[PDB]
Amino acid sequence: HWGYGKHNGPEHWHKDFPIAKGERQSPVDIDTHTAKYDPSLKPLSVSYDQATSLRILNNGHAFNVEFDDSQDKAVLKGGPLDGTYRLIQFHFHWGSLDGQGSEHTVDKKKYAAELHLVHWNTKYGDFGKAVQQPDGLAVLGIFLKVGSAKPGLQKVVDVLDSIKTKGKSADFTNFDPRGLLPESLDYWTYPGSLTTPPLLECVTWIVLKEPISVSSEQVLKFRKLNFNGEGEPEELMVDNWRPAQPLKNRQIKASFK
Ligand SMILES: NS(=O)(=O)c1ccco1
Ligand SMILES: NS(=O)(=O)c1ccco1
Ligand SMILES: [Zn+2]
């Protein structure tokens, strides 16, 4: 029953998920002048050469491109991370118009959308165990700005017509998520949470500084999806972003000078 309408949107979630008002909630505004360069952070290692995409699913809140995470095929390591984190899925959050949609903001700037590549720490053995641990997940966040098309996004855009409504899925094999990355891997990092219920405080956030450019026609196709199920009154899937939460007692670290 939570969602992104007036009646069940982010300002309501705390009633069922009281950790919504916790001490390490996400997303947050990244104040670029306050984030300190940490010459002790490593370069991220994004090792997607062996990624196995399987399926795309409209879950009623976003669409997820799911991967085979039963072995170490597509992993995130390095950066602020200890150990190895397996890619399980990616998804986006976006707006009704290009001036909003991202969950993190940069000096209060909102981007048209934000991609989240979700990985879990193999030392916990499965995703459901990893979300119960403060170092269980690593989510790589990438901003989308509207300009030139992103060629590696078009395969995702073109299948959306087949998963319009909640509970629909489609085969989605052989998709290479390296085509969704920007040139640079410079990033900010901080400890946070899932941004959807149950809002668990289990995420090391790694947010890339360089946005990727996507076309207006590409993000318009995201906005044709539906929150509702088949044959239900149409509620366009737009504005499925949680706003910035209080930073509290946390420090955002930059990987770059
Ligand atoms: N807390 S919640 O967002 O799941 C909800 C259910 C009904 C109203 O608010
Ligand atoms: N949006 S996100 O990447 O923090 C996420 C993954 C699973 C639940 O919430
Ligand atoms: Zn997300």
Curated annotation (Swiss-Prot):
Free-text remark on how the cofactor is bound: Zinc. Can also use cobalt(II) with lower efficiency, but not copper(II), nickel(II) and manganese(II).
CDD domains: alpha_CA_I_II_III_XIII (cd03119)
Protein name: Carbonic anhydrase 2
Name of the coding gene: CA2
Binding site for Zn(2+): 91, 93, 116
Result of altering residue 59 to T: Reduced activity
pH and activity: Optimum pH is 6-8.
Phenotype for residue 139 to F/Y: Strongly impaired activity
Listed result of changing residue 59 to D: Strongly reduced activity
PANTHER family: CARBONIC ANHYDRASE, CARBONIC ANHYDRASE 2
Protein's organism: Homo sapiens
